[PDB]
Structure 1
Amino acid sequence: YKLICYYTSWSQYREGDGSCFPDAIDPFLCTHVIYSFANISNNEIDTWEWNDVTLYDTLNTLKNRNPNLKTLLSVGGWNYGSQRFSKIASKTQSRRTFIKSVPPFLRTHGFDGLDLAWLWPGWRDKRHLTTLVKEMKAEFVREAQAGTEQLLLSAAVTAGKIAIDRGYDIAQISRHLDFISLLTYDFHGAWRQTVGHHSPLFRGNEDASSRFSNADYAVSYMLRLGAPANKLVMGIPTFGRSYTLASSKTDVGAPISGPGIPGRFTKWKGILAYYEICDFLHGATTHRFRDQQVPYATKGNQWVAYDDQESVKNKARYLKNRQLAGAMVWALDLDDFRGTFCGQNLTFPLTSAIKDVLARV
C-alpha cells in the first residue's frame, strides 16, 4: 500500500507553531513524500523559493533514517499558470528542453522522481499532456541505462468529471505514469453561493444534479476510463473549507456571503488547517452528513466543512475494498504535525489514521 504525502514550500513562513520544515516529518509515516512546487525557467525545471536547495536537502536526509522512502519534486501547482505549461508543451523545441533538464536536476538534489501538477489542461491541451507524459517517461527510461535506478514519474489529476474529459487522455497516460493521484477534495467551493462539502465520499440521495461530485463516482469513472487500480491513488484532505454564512440557515443548502475568515496561522480566506480546526471546534456545533459520511461544524456565522479521524479512516477502507494502490494526502503541514492542538498527544493524527487502515487487513 502506497502513502503519498505532499509537503508545501510556503509552509515555512507560517508563524509560531504554524511553522513547518521537512524536519517535522516523521520518516516512517509515508512511503513517498512529494515536495511542492518547482518552477520552470528558461524552459528548464528550477527552484521556487530562495532556500529551496536547503529544504530539498533537509527532506532528502530523511532517507538516512529510512532507506526505503522515496521522494519526488512536483512542477506546476495552482499559483503557476496553466498557460505557461501549455506554452512549453505544444512547441517541440521547448518541451524537449524542459524534458532534458529534469534527470540532471533531480539527481543533483537527490529526488527519486517528478510529479506533474499541471492544473488544468484545456480541451486544446489534451494532445499535448499526453506527449509530455510520453516523452518524459522515455527520457527517464533512457537515463536508467547509465546504471541508476529509474526515476519515477507521476501526475496529479483533478477529479471533476468535466475537467477529466476536457483534458486528460486517461487510457494513454496511465501506461506511462507510475501512479496517478486523484484530487478528490475539490467538489465544492465558495464559487457556489451555498454551503456544501468538498470531499463527500458518497453521493447521498439528497440532491441529484451533481451525482458526479464525490470520491466514489470519480474513482469509478477513472476505472472505466482505463486507469488500472494498481496505479490510482485517492486523495484525502487534511484541511477544511470555511464559509461566512449569509443568514441563520445552517442546514444543507444554506446561503453564503463568501469564504470564511482566515485562520490565525494559515492566513487564507476559505481554508483552515486541521490544527486550526481542532481549536475552532471548541464551542462549535458538531454536525455530520450521514448519507455522504463527512462532517461539518458551525459557530457564530462561520460554517466549516472538514475531515476527521472517522471520515478519513472511512475513505481509507473505501480505497482498500476497491483495491486501489493507496492514498495521497494534501498536505502534511496542514495536519497536526506537532501533535499538540488536537487533544490526544499524537502527531499527524489524520495521516496516522489513514496508515492504520492501510496497514491492516
Structure 2
Amino acid sequence: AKLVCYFTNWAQYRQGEARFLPKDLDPSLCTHLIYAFAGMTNHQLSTTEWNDETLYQEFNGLKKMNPKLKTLLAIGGWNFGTQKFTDMVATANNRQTFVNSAIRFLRKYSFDGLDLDWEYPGSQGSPAVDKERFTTLVQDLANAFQQEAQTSGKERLLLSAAVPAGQTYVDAGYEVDKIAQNLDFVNLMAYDFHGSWEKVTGHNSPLYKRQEESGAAASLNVDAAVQQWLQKGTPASKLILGMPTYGRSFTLASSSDTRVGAPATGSGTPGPFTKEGGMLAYYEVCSWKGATKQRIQDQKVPYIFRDNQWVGFDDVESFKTKVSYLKQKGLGGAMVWALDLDDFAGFSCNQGRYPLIQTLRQELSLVPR
C-alpha cells in the first residue's frame, strides 16, 4: 500500500499554530511525499516560491531519516491554470525542452519523480487538442525517464498524475487507458465534488450518492469516480484514492434549513487561519464551539453547522470508511490533500498530531513497525 501526501509551499505563510514549517514534516507518516507546486518558465520546470530551494533540501532531507521514503515534485495545481501547459505541449520541441529540464531539475534537487497536476487538459481554457497532447506528454516523460535510468544507472524517476473525478473533465482531457500504462500511479482527486460554486449545500467528498440524486449528480461521489477510472482502464494497483483534510463551507439562506441540499447564498465565512471563503481546514471545524455535527447516512460522511454556516468535511470515521472501501476495491493506496490542513501539530482537535493522516496510515497497515 501507498500513502501519498501533499505538502504545500504556501502553508508556511499562515499565522500562529497553523503555520506549517519544515519541523512539522514527519519522515515516516507517508510512503510518498509530493511537493506542491513547481511551475514553468519558457517551457522549463521552475520554482514558485522564493525559498523553494531551501524547502527542497529539508523535504528531500527527510529521506536521510527514512530511506524508504520517496519524494515527488508536482507541477501545476488549480491556480496555475492551463496556458503554460498548452503552450508547452503544442510542439515536440517544447515538450522536449520541458522533459529534459524536468530530468535535470529533479536530479539536481534530489526528487524521486514528477507528479503532473495540470488542471486540466481540454478544460479551463485548454483546447480539445490538448487531450491527445497530454497523452503524448505523459508518454514522452515516461519514456525519457526510462532512458535516463538506463544511461545513468540510477533508479528510474517516478511519474504520477493528479486526475479529476468528474466525467466532464475526464472525458475532455484524459485517454485513461493510454495514460495509465505510462503512469507509475494515479492520484485521484476524489474531493471538490460539491462546494459554494453551487447554490445548494453538498458534501466535498461523499462516498456514495444520496437517494434523491439523479442524472450527472449521481456520479459526483467517490465510488463513482473510482469505478469511472477503473472501468476506463486504470489498473486498480495504480489507482490511489485521494482524501481531503479540509471541508467545503456554505452560507445557508436560512439557519432553519440545514439539510444537505438546502439553499445556500454563497461561500461560508473564511476560516481564522486559512482565510479562504468556501473551505476550512480540518483543524478549523473539528473544534467548532456551539455547532451541531451531523452525518449524511447515504454518503458516509459528516457535516456540521452553526447558525447560517454549513460545512461538509471528513473525520476519522469517514477516513476509516474510505480506506475500507479502497481495500475492498483493491486500490493501490490513499492520497491526501494536504499535510498542512490536518491538525498537523495537534493544536486544535485534541486528537494528537496528524489525526486524520495517522488514521490513513493505521488503516492501511503502514505504521512503522
Task: Please give the TM-score of this superposition, normalised by the length of structure 2.
Answer: 0.95
Shift of 1:206: 2.6
Cα separation, 2, equivalents of 1:205 and 1:260: 26
Asked whether the 8 Å contact 2:323–2:360 carries over to 1, the reply is yes
Equivalent position to 1:273, from 260, 272, 281: 281
Asked whether the 8 Å contact 1:234–1:328 carries over to 2, the reply is yes
Cα separation, 2, equivalents of 1:11 and 1:107: 25
Structure 2: where are the runs of 5+ without partners?
123-127
Shift of 1:23: 2.2
Cα separation, 1, equivalents of 2:199 and 2:22: 37
Instruction: Confirm whether residue 198 of structure 1 aligns to residue 204 of structure 2.
Output: yes
Aligned letter for 2:331? L
Cα separation, 1, equivalents of 2:336 and 2:19: 19
Q: Residue 294 of structure 1 corresponds to which residue in structure 2?
A: 301
Cα separation, 2, equivalents of 1:115 and 1:102: 11
Shift of 1:87: 1.2
Instruction: Confirm whether residue 214 of structure 1 aligns to residue 252 of structure 2.
Output: no
Cα separation, 1, equivalents of 2:261 and 2:102: 47
Equivalent position to 1:159, from 162, 165, 169: 165
**Local SS of the residue matching 1:341:** coil
Q: Residue 17 of structure 1 corresponds to which residue in structure 2?
A: 17
Equivalent position to 1:140, from 132, 138, 145: 145
Instruction: Confirm whether residue 255 of structure 1 aligns to residue 255 of structure 2.
Output: no
Aligned letter for 1:265? F
**Local SS of the residue matching 1:38:** strand
Shift of 1:10: 0.5
Cα separation, 1, equivalents of 2:6 and 2:298: 29
**C-alpha root-mean-square deviation of aligned residues, in Å?**
1.0
Instruction: Confirm whether residue 179 of structure 1 aligns to residue 154 of structure 2.
Output: no
Asked whether the 8 Å contact 2:282–2:341 carries over to 1, the reply is yes
Instruction: Confirm whether residue 230 of structure 1 aligns to residue 237 of structure 2.
Output: yes
**Local SS of the residue matching 2:143:** helix
Asked whether the 8 Å contact 1:23–1:59 carries over to 2, the reply is no
Q: Residue 248 of structure 2 corresponds to which residue in structure 1?
A: 241
Cα separation, 1, equivalents of 2:350 and 2:160: 36
Cα separation, 2, equivalents of 1:340 and 1:2: 27
Equivalent position to 1:284, from 291, 311, 324: 291
Cα separation, 2, equivalents of 1:73 and 1:175: 20
Shift of 1:83: 2.0
Cα separation, 2, equivalents of 1:335 and 1:83: 32
Shift of 1:246: 1.2
Cα separation, 1, equivalents of 2:248 and 2:221: 16
Cα separation, 2, equivalents of 1:131 and 1:198: 32
How many positions carry a matched residue from both structures?
358
Shift of 1:203: 1.4
Q: Residue 29 of structure 1 corresponds to which residue in structure 2?
A: 29
Equivalent position to 2:320, from 313, 320, 331: 313
Shift of 1:103: 1.1
Q: Residue 339 of structure 1 corresponds to which residue in structure 2?
A: 346
**Local SS of the residue matching 2:287:** helix
Query: Which string of whole-angstrom CA distances, capped at 9 and with x for unpartnered residues, describes residues 6-51 of structure 1?
Result: 0000000001111102321211110000000001012110111000
**Local SS of the residue matching 2:10:** helix
Aligned letter for 2:146? V
Asked whether the 8 Å contact 2:17–2:347 carries over to 1, the reply is no
Shift of 1:61: 1.1
Q: Residue 170 of structure 1 corresponds to which residue in structure 2?
A: 176
Asked whether the 8 Å contact 2:164–2:188 carries over to 1, the reply is yes
Query: Which string of whole-angstrom CA distances, capped at 9 and with x for unpartnered residues, describes residues 32-84 of structure 1?
Result: 00000001012110111000000011111111110000000000111112122
Aligned letter for 1:36? A
Query: Which string of whole-angstrom CA distances, capped at 9 and with x for unpartnered residues, describes residues 151-203 of structure 1?
Result: 00000110001211111000000110100011010111212101111210011
Q: Residue 66 of structure 1 corresponds to which residue in structure 2?
A: 66
Asked whether the 8 Å contact 1:21–1:55 carries over to 2, the reply is no
Cα separation, 1, equivalents of 2:83 and 2:42: 15
Query: Which string of whole-angstrom CA distances, capped at 9 and with x for unpartnered residues, describes residues 116-169 of structure 1?
Result: 000011133110000000011111111112111100000011000121111100
Aligned letter for 1:274? Y
Q: Residue 127 of structure 1 corresponds to which residue in structure 2?
A: 132
Aligned letter for 1:13? Y
Aligned letter for 1:95? R
Shift of 1:286: 1.3
Query: Which string of whole-angstrom CA distances, capped at 9 and with x for unpartnered residues, describes residues 273-315 of structure 1?
Result: 11111232x2101111011111000001111110000001100
Asked whether the 8 Å contact 2:43–2:84 carries over to 1, the reply is no
Structure 1: where are the runs of 5+ without partners?
none
**Local SS of the residue matching 1:139:** helix
Asked whether the 8 Å contact 1:184–1:235 carries over to 2, the reply is yes
Cα separation, 2, equivalents of 1:293 and 1:170: 28
Cα separation, 2, equivalents of 1:286 and 1:20: 27
Asked whether the 8 Å contact 1:159–1:183 carries over to 2, the reply is yes
Asked whether the 8 Å contact 1:278–1:341 carries over to 2, the reply is yes
